[PDB]
C-alpha cells in the first residue's frame, strides 16, 4: 500500500479542534481510520496567532515537522523558539506545549509511531 | 528528552551518499546513533535534477514529507507525481522509487518507526 496526500486532498475532512487548545486545529492525512495504513500516522496542525497547544504528554514518541510560521516550544519547562524548516523530537512521556506568539499561522505535521491518532491518549500536564 | 533540529544543526555532519542512488544525498536529524532518541527516526534527503532513488523496499513502514521541488514516485509499478506540500505513506516492504524530473532540487524528510537509520536494511527490487 502506497499513497500520497496533501491539504487539498482532505478539503472534505472537517477540521478537528477542542476548547482546551485555543486557536489550534488539525486534520489527519495518514491514519488507519482513514487510509488503512499502519506503523506510522501523521496529521497536519495549524495554530492561529495567539493560539496555544497547552502542556501535555503521551506515551509514544512524537515528531513535529514545522512547515510555516514560528512559535514557542515548551520543552518541559524550557522555552525555545521554533520555525519553518525545524523538526522536533519529543520523547514519550515528555511534557510539551507550543504557542504561536507571531502573526503568521504556525503550521506543522506531527508523526506518531502508531496506526491511528485515536489510539494515542493525551494527558494534561500533571 | 525533547530537541529541535534543522539543516544548520547538522552543518557539522557531512552529507551521506552512495552509488546505488546517484545524485542523492542525505543527513540524519533524529537518530539514536546521534541523539539517543527512540521510537521514531527522521532524515532529510536531496535529489538533484536527474537523480533517481531507485526501486527498493525495507521492512519498516515509511513516510516522506516533501518540502521542495517535484518528483515522480513509483508506487510499486504505478507512477504518481509528488511535490512540495505532499506527504507519502509507504507500507512496510512495499517496493518504491522516486525520481527528480524537475529543474529544482527535490527535497524531503523521511521517517521510520525505528530508533535509528542504520538498523534498516534496504533491498533492491526483483
Ligand atoms: Mn504532542
Ligand atoms: Mn524508502
TrEMBL record, chains A, B:
Residues that, per the record, bind Zn(2+): 56, 58, 62, 96
Domain of life of the source: Bacteria
Gene3D superfamilies noted in UniProt: Jelly Rolls (2.60.120.10)
Binding site residues for Fe(3+): 58, 62, 64, 96
A single GO molecular function term of this UniProt record: metal ion binding
Residue intervals of the Cupin type-2 domain: 44-112
Residues annotated as binding Mn(2+): 56, 58, 62, 96
Keywords carried by this UniProt record: Metal-binding, Zinc
Pfam families assigned: Cupin_2 (PF07883)
Protein name: Novel protein with potential Cupin domain
Organism this protein belongs to: Pelagibacter ubique (strain HTCC1062)
Amino acid at each position: 500500500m502506497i499513497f500520497v496526500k496533501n491539504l487539498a486532498s482532505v478539503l472534505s475532512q472537517e477540521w478537528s479542534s477542542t476548547e482546551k487548545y485555543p486557536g489550534v486545529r488539525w486534520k489527519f492525512l495518514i491514519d488507519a481510520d482513514f487510509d488503512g495504513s499502519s506503523g506510522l500516522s501523521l496529521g497536519f496542525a495549524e495554530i492561529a496567532p495567539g493560539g496555544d497547544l497547552t502542556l501535555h504528554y503521551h506515551s509514544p514518541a512524537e515528531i513535529y515537522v514545522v512547515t510555516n510560521g514560528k512559535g514557542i516550544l515548551n520543552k518541559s519547562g524550557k522555552l525555545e523558539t521554533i520555525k519553518k524548516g525545524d523538526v522536533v523530537y519529543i520523547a514519550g512521556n515528555a511534557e510539551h506545549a507550543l504557542k504561536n506568539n507571531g502573526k503568521e499561522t504556525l503550521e506543522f505535521y506531527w508523526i506518531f509511531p502508531t496506526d491511528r491518532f485515536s489510539e494515542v491518549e493525551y494527558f494534561p500536564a500533571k
